[PDB]
Design a protein around this motif. Structure first.
Motif, short mmCIF file in Angstrom:
data_model
loop_
_atom_site.label_atom_id
_atom_site.label_comp_id
_atom_site.label_asym_id
_atom_site.label_seq_id
_atom_site.Cartn_x
_atom_site.Cartn_y
_atom_site.Cartn_z
N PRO A 66 0.84 -1.21 0.00
CA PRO A 66 0.00 0.00 0.00
C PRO A 66 0.87 1.26 0.00
CG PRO A 66 0.19 -0.77 2.20
CD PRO A 66 0.88 -1.81 1.34
N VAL A 91 -9.68 -3.60 -4.59
CA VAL A 91 -9.37 -2.21 -4.27
C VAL A 91 -10.52 -1.66 -3.44
CG1 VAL A 91 -8.97 0.10 -5.19
CG2 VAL A 91 -7.98 -1.89 -6.32
N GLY A 93 -12.28 -3.22 -1.38
CA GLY A 93 -12.09 -3.73 -0.03
C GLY A 93 -11.06 -2.93 0.75
N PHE A 94 -9.97 -2.58 0.07
CA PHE A 94 -8.90 -1.80 0.65
C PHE A 94 -9.48 -0.46 1.11
CE2 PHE A 94 -4.75 -0.42 1.49
CZ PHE A 94 -4.47 0.78 0.87
N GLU A 96 -12.53 0.33 1.81
CA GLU A 96 -13.47 0.14 2.93
C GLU A 96 -12.70 0.06 4.25
OE1 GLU A 96 -16.76 -0.07 3.17
OE2 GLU A 96 -17.39 -0.12 1.08
N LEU A 97 -11.53 -0.58 4.22
CA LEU A 97 -10.71 -0.72 5.41
C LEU A 97 -10.08 0.63 5.78
CD1 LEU A 97 -9.14 -4.16 4.55
CD2 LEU A 97 -10.59 -3.62 6.56
N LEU A 98 -9.81 1.47 4.78
CA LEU A 98 -9.25 2.80 5.00
C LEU A 98 -10.38 3.71 5.48
CD1 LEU A 98 -6.89 3.46 1.93
CD2 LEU A 98 -6.27 3.16 4.32
#
Lengths: 311, 319
Positions: A66, A91, A93-94, A96-98
Motif C-alpha cells: 500500500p 481495491v 475492499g482496501f 473500505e478498510l481505510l
C-alpha cells in the motif's frame, strides 16, 4: 470537496484507463488529485503521476502497495481501474478498510459482476434473461446441455484473453485447457448469431436511472472501428425493456455509482450479457455520451457520481 | 513455513475472535505470529498483540490501517475475523492486493456468503433447498408471498441485531424500520416451527470433505431445588441423532453448496430440519476455533485432530 482519482492498473486496460482518467480531470467540477498504478503494480503519486498521465502509460511505478498516500486529504476516492485489482472488489475492499467513501460498486457487487458464473446464476434466478451457459471447473467432466457453437472463457478474468469459439465438441477439451490457465473456473456460453449489441448506462445507488439505449456496430477490418449509434434504432418498446432489465439487475446486484449494462439482441430476444461497474470516461466513451444524450452534461455526470459516493 | 494470524476486529465478535486466535496459537504445528485489530480499528503487533490476547479484549490499537507489517516474512495469512471487515471480502481483497496466500474463502465467496439475499438466490438457482424468503429495501413497498410468522432481518449474514419475528402483517412495517436501522436491505424469511438446527463442517478447496453432522439444542436457565441457579446452555450433540438417510443428505447438501459457491479452505454449514425437510440456513466462511466451537469439535469426531486440521487449512491456502 477534495477528490482522489486512481488510474492505470496492472490490467490490459491500463492505457484506456489513463485516457478516461484524463477525461475526468479535464471536466470534473471539484479539485482533484491523481494517483497512478503502474503495470508493475507500483504506485505513482503527485507530479510523477501527472507525467504518467501525459505519456498515457506507466510501465513501472515507485511505491509498493500500500502506497504512502495521505487519504485524510480526500473526501471521496474515484477508482478507475479495470479487471483484476480494479472492478473485482479488491481495491474496493482496501478503501473500505481505510474508511474512505468511493465511487462505484462496493466489494460484493464488483466481485459478483466480475464472475460470469455467479452473476448469471443470480440474474437468472431473478428472472433477468442471460445467454444459456454452464460452469466447468478444472478436473471435472464437461456437461454442455447445448450443441456448438459456443464460447469458452475463464470465469472471473473479465477480459477477452483465454476466450475461444468452439465449433465441435472435440475441441472443447483444449478450450477448457486454455481458460483453466487463467482461472480454475470457466464458463461455456451458447454463441448467438446474428446478434446485435445494445448498451445502456445506469446512475444512482441501487435504485438508478437509465440513460437512453445505444448500440455498438463494428465496421469492416482494414481492426474495424466500433460505431456507437445513439440512440439505437429499436422499437419504442424493446428499448424500455432494455432499460427496465438494466435497472432490475442493477437493483438485485446492489450496484452503487454507475454501470454500463451490455445486452445481446438475437431474433427478438434480449440477453443481459455483462454489467460493467467501471465503464469508460473519455468524452468519446459510450458511457458519458449515452448520458449526454439523456440530458446529463458530462461535468454534471461526474458531480452526481462523487455526491452519490457520500450517500 | 511461517503463518500470520489476524484476530480481534471491530465487529461484536471481537472477543470470540481472540478466543479463536488463542486456540489456533496453542495447537498450530507451524511457527506462527499474531496481529490483532483492536476495537477502535487500529492494529497491535508483536508483543502488544500477545498482551491483548491475555486480556481477552483489545479496546485500543497503535497503528491505523494499513498496518506496518512485514508481510514478506509470512507464507500464509490466516484471518480469524468475523463479520464486518472479517468475512465480507474486504480483508481478503487487501490480502489479494498484497499478493499474500490466505486461509478460507476468497473475495466473491466471502461477500456472497455474508449476504442473506444473494447467497440464497445462488443456492436456489443451483437446486439447494433454502427457507422461502424475499428481499426488501428501504423505500420499496414490502411484497411477501407467504403468511406469517416470519423473520425480518438485516441482509448482512451473521448479524444478530435488528432481527424480529413478526406475527401479523401490520407488524411488518415496524420490523422493517428496525432492520433498516443497520442495513438498507432486509430479508423476510418464513419461520418453521418446530425445527432442529444441524451443523456440518467442510474442509478443502471447492470440492470438500465433510465432517460428521452435529446438532445444537438450547437449555433454558432455571432454579434447581438443591443447586439453585443453572445458566442456560447450548448443547452440542456429536454426532447429531439422525437416521442414516438424513445425515447423508445434509452432508451432501453442504458439499454441493460449498462447491457451487466456490468456497475455499473451510466452512460451517448450518441447516434447519423441519417436518422431514432440510433447509440450508447459513454458510459460515470463518468458523470458531475455540476448543468448544462446533467446528473443530465436528472434525475431531471425524478423525481429524485439531493440530492436523490447522495444518491442512494452512496447506490448502497454497492450494
Amino acid at each position: 470537496m477534495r477528490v482522489l482519482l486512481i488510474a492505470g492498473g496492472v490490467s490490459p486496460e491500463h492505457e484506456v484507463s489513463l485516457l478516461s482518467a484524463e477525461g475526468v480531470l479535464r471536466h470534473i467540477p471539484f479539485p482533484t488529485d491523481l494517483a497512478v498504478i503502474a503495470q508493475d503494480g507500483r504506485w505513482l503519486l503527485g507530479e510523477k503521476a501527472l507525467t504518467a498521465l501525459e505519456a498515457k502509460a506507466a510501465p513501472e511505478g515507485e511505491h509498493p502497495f500500500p502506497p504512502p498516500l495521505s487519504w485524510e486529504r480526500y473526501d471521496v476516492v474515484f477508482p478507475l481501474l479495470h479487471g483484476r485489482f480494479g472492478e473485482d472488489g479488491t481495491v474496493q475492499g482496501f478503501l473500505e478498510l481505510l474508511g474512505k467513501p468511493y465511487v462505484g460498486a462496493g466489494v460484493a457487487a464488483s466481485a459478483l459482476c466480475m464472475d460470469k458464473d455467479l452473476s448469471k446464476r443470480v440474474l437468472a434466478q431473478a428472472g433477468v434473461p442471460v445467454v444459456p451457459w454452464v460452469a466447468v471447473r478444472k478436473g471435472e467432466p464437461p456437461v454442455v446441455p447445448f450443441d456448438p457453437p459456443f464460447f469458452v472463457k475463464p470465469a472471473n478474468t473479465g477480459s477477452s484473453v483465454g476466450i475461444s469459439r468452439v465449433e465441435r465438441f472435440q475441441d472443447l477439451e483444449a478450450a477448457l485447457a486454455l481458460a483453466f490457465r487463467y482461472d480454475e473456473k470457466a464458463v461455456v456460453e451458447k454463441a448467438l448469431s446474428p446478434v446485435r449489441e445494445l448498451e445502456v448506462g445506469v446512475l444512482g445507488n441501487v435504485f438508478g436511472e437509465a440513460s437512453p439505449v445505444g448500440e455498438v456496430r463494428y465496421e469492416a477490418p482494414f481492426p474495424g472501428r466500433a460505431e456507437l449509434l445513439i440512440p439505437a434504432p429499436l422499437d419504442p418498446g424493446t428499448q424500455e425493456t432494455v432499460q427496465e432489465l438494466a435497472l432490475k439487475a442493477y437493483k438485485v446486484l446492489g450496484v452503487r455509482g454507475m454501470a454500463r449494462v451490455d445486452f445481446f439482441l438475437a431474433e427478438g430476444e434480449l440477453y443481459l450479457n455483462e454489467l460493467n461497474t467501471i465503464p469508460g470516461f473519455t468524452p468519446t466513451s459510450m458511457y458519458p455520451r449515452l448520458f449526454e444524450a439523456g440530458g446529463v452534461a458530462y461535468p454534471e455526470l461526474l458531480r452526481r457520481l462523487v455526491e452519490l459516493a457520500l450517500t
